[PDB]
Design an enzyme around this catalytic site. Structure first.
Site: not given
Lengths: 184, 79, 50, 605, 431
Positions: E12, E63, E198, E246
């Site tokens: 992802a 992978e 999602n 900041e």
């Protein structure tokens, strides 16, 4: 090649177990043969070079004649058995004077000639399987005055069984060595 | 081209000293001037229909929609 | 630029006047071609009245 | 008048068959047959079949030709017997299910045989004395598979049905019982996928070419396997095209584009020639010394039997073609684009000058520049490309243009801007430069596809023919909308009048409609032919001629102001999709969907 | 010159970064091979004397299947050929494959590339990791990484744009096992954590925008726009500039409440932009609705504790002050005693950019906001209930004790989440 590669503790060329082990080595067969057959002691595949002539049948690790592999690692280690037939192996180096020297260790000598480019030397193998650890960074400190920077080609001629030709950063012991780099 | 005898004997001799054996003088010095549809273009990368990315066209011919999906909470959903 | 700035509004009016005149004149010339055409519905009604 | 037939169908096997007087070549097209002479006298497109012809068989004497076709599920499909003297539909023989896979003649001319059905497979035997069926039977081994092809003997009574997946069955025909008897040729351990067949002269052996690549010789008397195929270099793809000779030297051809001379004991390539595209037809002139090869990519190869030298004689596309455009100022060049391909032609002598392939995607639209610098095209891969005029170099591509494939593309006359519309509806404008090409603003009026984009003579306005029911006029110098045509037609062609008075629309609903350039006010509607559709309009430089082409075979010359029709649309009924006149006002050129580019002379309207 | 290092660990992470690294190519003039045609690019791309610009990002997966899309896709000339570290076999939803025996091989390579990039930046400002909670490598490789990176470098800031598993929908089975174990890492060796989910980006993708069938190539572009808004002030100029300490000093009150949400304000189509006026006062008010959370909770049932903002575009601060006064006046938005200001504003002088093929319009005003809120403890309650309902019958634990992980660390991360959920309400109660 091998300039941008990390080159850590154990760097390996030519594992006998592979879809293409000799993809980077250039082979020149001349009254001889190369194959992949099973040894009857370690019971997994090894390579096989033979030939009536020691000197013409060989495999060379940089395939390109111009190109050289730059490996900074001190020790070169191979896994080659004893066959009671003649067998040679050769490297080049590079030293701090920016010169390319040689170190040939052949089966059939008794005199080491310290010389400018070619320091021929003997060896003696044992009765069974053995591995060879080479000690590059003391051979070019003792015979030649210089120190060690690079090792640029490697080339092995006739009559041996080949598996796992790898470089090292020091001398490991058998317990300190990992699971794959052992013999049996 | 030739400015003297030296560059006459070596500019085009065509005589390997290594290979030519038991020769003669005239066989040494020999120059070379004595001796003498439908067209097409092919794209390099063979593309694939399945690996395209523009959109996912509707199963119903949504110009005149076939199974009515409205926009959630009122109105047209598609295009 | 500053010399011609004193007449800024007259060119703004002139462009609108010219575009409206050209559009309406195009309409009138197309009406001339339409009235010279013969297979119209109202023209067929006029010929049937004749 | 009618001239310059271009296309070819070589997509189905054995479409090319020279008749035994060795002058005219018949070959199919999308829905008809064509006969070409030595002088290219296109002759008598023989009309009919309702849909796509797929299979051709010729009587041995040289008087009758019979061709099948393909229709919908559960519909009949009609063999048609024609003549070779007065090109008249003699007999319509319509008795099968679905489609017709194979037809063949008998050497005494009385008998024809037909294999039909992908699912409902049967063989029927037709007589020519009365246009009816004698008898029929399922020509497919149950617990085997299906079958493809048939051929008669020269005993005039026994015929072979050929393995689709491994059924090889001889039938013997007897008249008084009115019957055909099935026996099967038993093979030892071989199970091939047989994919072509020919027969020797003396009925001694017939040969089968298989998908596995080996040539099988057969014996029709023993009803047993006669001979195996080659070991050590079986042909690459399947054996697709087998022909015989008067002697015993078989001509093999494989669908990877290879031609090999072959003999029966040792199948060894005595004479081999690698050809263009997969071979699917071999046809041999009755003199013997020259023959013809039909290929899957539509190339007809006249190849001499002595010394095996080839000469291509006909080339065209091999899918649905679309969107010709002439160059401005030159009437001698064509660009024709289709699936995976773009070709640049000649006009008069019909040679092909260059060809450019995208691998497997789909093209939609092609256009030239206003100068001769580049050719832009719009493809279905979500991309817009542009190509060099000669040598086919790719000058540029545009990565993610639309969300669906880009459909219509247009050129501005100052060679700075390209307008694209695609199936998404996001109308996009591309400013080109020497270094890069950029997008300015996306105009998203539309809700459906985009058909055509056409711009004013001096760029200022454009128009987007679309299948939504709305045709927009946009302005260029600002990016906003002026006027909308809202109408009851899925639009295909929208053309400007010369001198820019009015704009004309067509489409599915068959109402050629002139439109007022302001307000979208409709003027009049002039109908199409009858119950077809229309996809391509054309006006000349002056603006009195008006060319219209559509879904039936009819191309129509029209007067502009009044509705005057002039039909020379007797050509192909493969759905004509675009049509342009030469800039010299000499030829009218139309692209028929099944690949056929036809030009007629110019009439004065 | 104010650089950052942005790692993408997992699948992802790499597939978000595939959509992050053309928005940066389109903000500047960098065409994909690396040659600008015509130093505000400096934080993200180094430059090399043949014209070629190279990224600052590392891509790792154990992978090789997903990195080999990039390696022969459209962005193969852009990346350096050792920014792309590959492997042979994945971790396959197990935390132990990745953080333990088989995952200890590529860590030396990823640390070499972190060292070899961080040793060439003139000014280093911190880390942007993109790692998935949902992964087997994306949540074990990063926990193997951060425990060594924070020993090496230490004090520099860590920001993670991670993917929280949605409360109803989920696409694996041992997610309640893999989520709980990595928060033994991210509490102690990490300094901020921006989570998204999602299901809500599908929500905000279909309701505010006419997209049927929304996918990952719709998720990853909005989460790329969020990071291009947070990295705006290091690259551009404007009125109030906020740097990577900041705000990350503004946003962490206590050293275990460092879990803030994110929200991007203008999300709208290409058609209906003409009909909304799109003012500063209304796109400030769009930020504080319950409908527009990229993470599925209601902030109303909790309290915003601390906030932030990241403006852009054509704003002038009187409008922003008049917006913030109304937000403080309102009562849908509830706060705590220990932060009476509760706001932080940056500005910039750049509009959003429109990547071609994206389904967003060229809005000028743009807002992000990043909220420390105590109502993410509800989502941690909902994933909190999932764990002991599987550890009660000791399910799936042999796949963890096989690849080198003892059983008791399940109970250790259990009481770790127990202490964290003790902490949120104890710092959210009034005094």
């Amino acid at each position: 090649m091998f300039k941008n590669t990390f080159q850590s503790g154990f760097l390996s060329i030519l594992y006998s177990i592979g879809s293409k082990p000799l993809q980077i080595w250039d082979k020149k067969v001349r009254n001889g043969h190369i194959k992949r057959i099973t040894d009857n002691d370690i019971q997994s595949l090894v390579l096989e070079i033979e030939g009536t002539n020691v000197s013409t049948t060989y495999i060379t690790c940089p395939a390109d004649p111009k190109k050289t592999l730059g490996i900074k690692l001190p020790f070169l280690v191979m896994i080659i058995k004893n066959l009671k037939k003649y067998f040679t192996f050769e490297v080049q180096v590079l030293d701090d004077k920016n010169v390319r020297r040689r170190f040939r260790a052949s089966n059939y000598q008794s005199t080491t000639r310290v010389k400018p480019f070619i320091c021929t030397m003997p060896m003696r193998l044992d009765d069974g399987w053995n591995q060879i650890q080479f000690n590059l960074s003391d051979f070019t400190r003792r015979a030649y005055g210089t120190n060690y920077i690079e090792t640029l080609r490697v080339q092995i001629h006739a009559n041996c069984r080949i598996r796992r030709v790898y470089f090292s950063d020091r001398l490991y012991s058998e317990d300190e060595l990992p699971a794959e780099f052992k013999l049996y | 081209k030739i400015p003297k005898d030296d560059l006459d004997f070596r500019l085009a001799t065509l005589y390997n000293h290594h290979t030519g054996a038991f020769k003669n003088k005239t066989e040494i010095l020999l120059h070379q001037e004595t001796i003498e549809t439908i067209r097409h273009w092919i794209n390099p990368k063979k593309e694939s229909i399945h690996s395209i990315q523009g959109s996912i066209v509707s199963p119903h011919t949504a110009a005149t929609n076939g199974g009515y999906s409205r926009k959630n909470d009122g109105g047209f959903f598609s295009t | 630029r500053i010399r011609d700035s004193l007449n800024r509004l007259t060119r703004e009016a002139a462009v609108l006047r010219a575009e409206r005149a050209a559009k309406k004149k195009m309409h009138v010339k197309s009406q001339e071609l339409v009235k010279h055409w013969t297979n119209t519905y109202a023209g067929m009604k006029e010929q049937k009245l004749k | 008048e009618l001239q310059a037939v271009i296309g070819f169908n070589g997509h189905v096997p054995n479409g090319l068959k020279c008749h035994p007087d060795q002058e005219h070549l018949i070959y199919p097209l999308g829905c008809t047959v064509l006969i070409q002479a030595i002088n290219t006298n296109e002759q008598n497109f023989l009309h009919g079949h309702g849909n796509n012809v797929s299979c051709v068989t010729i009587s041995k004497e040289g008087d009758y030709i019979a061709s099948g076709q393909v229709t919908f599920m559960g519909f009949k499909a009609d063999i048609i017997l024609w003549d070779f003297k007065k090109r008249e539909l003699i007999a319509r023989l319509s008795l099968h299910k679905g489609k017709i896979e194979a037809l063949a003649f008998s050497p005494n001319d009385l008998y024809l045989v037909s294999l039909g059905g992908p699912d409902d497979g049967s063989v029927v035997v037709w007589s020519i004395a009365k246009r009816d069926a004698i008898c029929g039977s399922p020509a497919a081994g149950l617990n085997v598979g299906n079958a493809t092809s048939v051929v008669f003997s020269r005993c005039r009574d026994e015929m072979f049905v050929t393995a689709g997946n491994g059924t090889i069955r001889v039938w013997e025909l007897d008249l008084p019982n009115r019957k055909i008897w099935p026996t099967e040729c038993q093979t030892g351990q071989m199970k091939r996928i047989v994919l072509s067949t020919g027969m020797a002269d003396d009925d001694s052996f017939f040969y089968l070419g298989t998908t596995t690549g080996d040539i099988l010789k057969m014996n029709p008397k023993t009803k047993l396997l006669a001979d195996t195929g080659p070991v050590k270099d079986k042909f690459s793809l399947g054996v697709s095209a087998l022909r015989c000779l008067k002697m015993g030297g078989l001509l093999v051809g494989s669908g990877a584009g290879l031609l090999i001379f072959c003999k029966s004991p040792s199948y060894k390539p005595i004479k081999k020639v690698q050809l263009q595209g997969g071979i699917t037809s071999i046809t041999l002139r009755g003199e013997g010394h020259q023959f013809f090869v039909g290929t899957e990519e539509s190339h007809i190869y006249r190849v001499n039997f002595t010394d095996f030298k080839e000469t291509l004689i006909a080339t065209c596309h091999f899918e649905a073609v679309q969107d010709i455009v002439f160059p401005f100022g030159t009437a001698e060049l064509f660009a024709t684009c289709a699936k995976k391909d773009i070709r640049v032609w000649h006009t008069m002598s019909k040679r092909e000058l260059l060809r450019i392939t995208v691998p497997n995607m789909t093209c939609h639209g092609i256009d030239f520049m206003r100068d001769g610098k580049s050719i832009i095209s719009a493809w279905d891969d979500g991309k817009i490309r542009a190509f060099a005029p000669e040598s086919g170099r790719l000058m540029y591509t545009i990565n993610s243009a639309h969300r669906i494939g880009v459909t219509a593309i247009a050129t501005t006359s100052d060679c700075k801007r390209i307008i694209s519309g695609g199936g998404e509806g996001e109308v996009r404008v591309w400013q080109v430069g020497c270094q890069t090409q950029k997008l300015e603003e996306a105009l998203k009026e539309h809700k459906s596809s985009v058909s055509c984009i056409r711009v004013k003579k001096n760029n200022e306005e454009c128009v987007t023919a679309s299948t939504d029911g709305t045709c927009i006029i946009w302005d260029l110098v600002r990016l906003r909308r002026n006027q909308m045509i809202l109408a009851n037609t899925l639009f295909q062609c929208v053309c400007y009048h010369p001198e820019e008075f009015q704009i004309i629309t067509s489409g599915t609903d068959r109402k050629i409609a002139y439109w007022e350039v302001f307000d979208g006010s409709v003027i009049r509607e002039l109908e199409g032919s009858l119950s077809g559709s229309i996809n391509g309009m054309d006006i000349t430089q002056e603006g009195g001629h008006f060319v219209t082409g559509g879904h039936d075979h009819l191309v129509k010359v029209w007067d502009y102001n009044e509705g005057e029709v002039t039909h020379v649309g007797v050509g192909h009924s493969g759905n004509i999709m675009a049509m342009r006149i030469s800039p010299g006002n000499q030829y009218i050129v139309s692209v028929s969907a099944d690949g056929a580019i036809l030009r007629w002379k110019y009439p004065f309207a | 010159m104010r650089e950052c290092i942005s790692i993408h660990v997992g699948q992802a992470g790499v597939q978000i970064g595939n959509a992050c690294w053309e928005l940066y190519c389109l903000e500047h003039g960098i065409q994909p091979d690396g040659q600008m045609p015509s130093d505000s690019f400096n934080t993200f791309f180094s430059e090399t004397g043949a014209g070629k610009h190279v990224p600052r990002a590392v891509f790792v997966d154990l992978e090789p299947t997903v990195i080999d899309e990039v390696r022969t896709g459209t962005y193969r000339q852009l990346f350096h050929p050792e920014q792309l570290i590959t492997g042979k076999e994945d971790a396959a939803n197990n935390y132990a494959r990745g953080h333990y025996t088989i995952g200890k091989e590529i860590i030396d390579l990823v640390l070499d590339r972190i060292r070899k990039l961080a040793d060439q930046c003139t000014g280093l400002q911190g880390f942007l990791v993109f790692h998935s909670f949902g992964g087997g490598t994306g949540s074990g490789f990063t926990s193997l990484l951060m425990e060594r990176l924070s020993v090496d470098y230490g004090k520099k800031s860590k920001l993670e744009f991670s993917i929280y598993p949605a409360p109803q929908v989920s696409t694996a089975v041992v997610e309640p096992y893999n989520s709980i174990l990595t928060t033994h890492t991210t509490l102690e060796h990490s300094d901020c954590a921006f989570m998204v989910d999602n299901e809500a980006i599908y929500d905000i993708c279909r309701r505010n925008l006419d997209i049927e069938r929304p996918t990952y190539t719709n998720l990853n572009r909005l989460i790329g726009q969020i990071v291009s808004s947070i990295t705006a002030s290091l690259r551009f100029d404007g009125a109030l500039n906020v740097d990577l300490t900041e705000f990350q000093t503004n946003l962490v009150p206590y050293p275990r409440i460092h879990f803030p949400l994110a929200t991007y304000a203008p999300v709208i189509s290409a058609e209906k932009a003409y009909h909304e006026q799109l003012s500063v006062a209304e796109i400030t008010n769009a930020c504080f609705e319950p409908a527009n959370q990229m993470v599925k909770c209601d902030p109303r049932h909790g309290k915003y504790m601390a906030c932030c903002l990241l403006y852009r575009g054509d704003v002038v601060p009187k409008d922003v002050n008049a917006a913030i006064a109304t937000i403080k006046t309102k009562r849908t938005i509830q706060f705590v005693d220990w932060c009476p200001t509760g706001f932080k504003v940056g500005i910039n002088y750049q509009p959003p950019t429109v990547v071609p093929g994206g389904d967003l319009a060229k809005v000028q005003r743009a807002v992000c906001m990043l909220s420390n809120t105590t109502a993410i403890a509800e989502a941690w309650a909902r994933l909190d209930h999932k764990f002991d309902l599987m550890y009660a019958k000791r399910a799936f634990v042999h796949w963890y004790v096989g690849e080198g992980m003892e059983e008791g660390e399940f109970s250790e991360a259990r009481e770790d989440m127990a202490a964290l959920e003790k902490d949120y309400e104890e710092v959210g109660v009034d005094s």
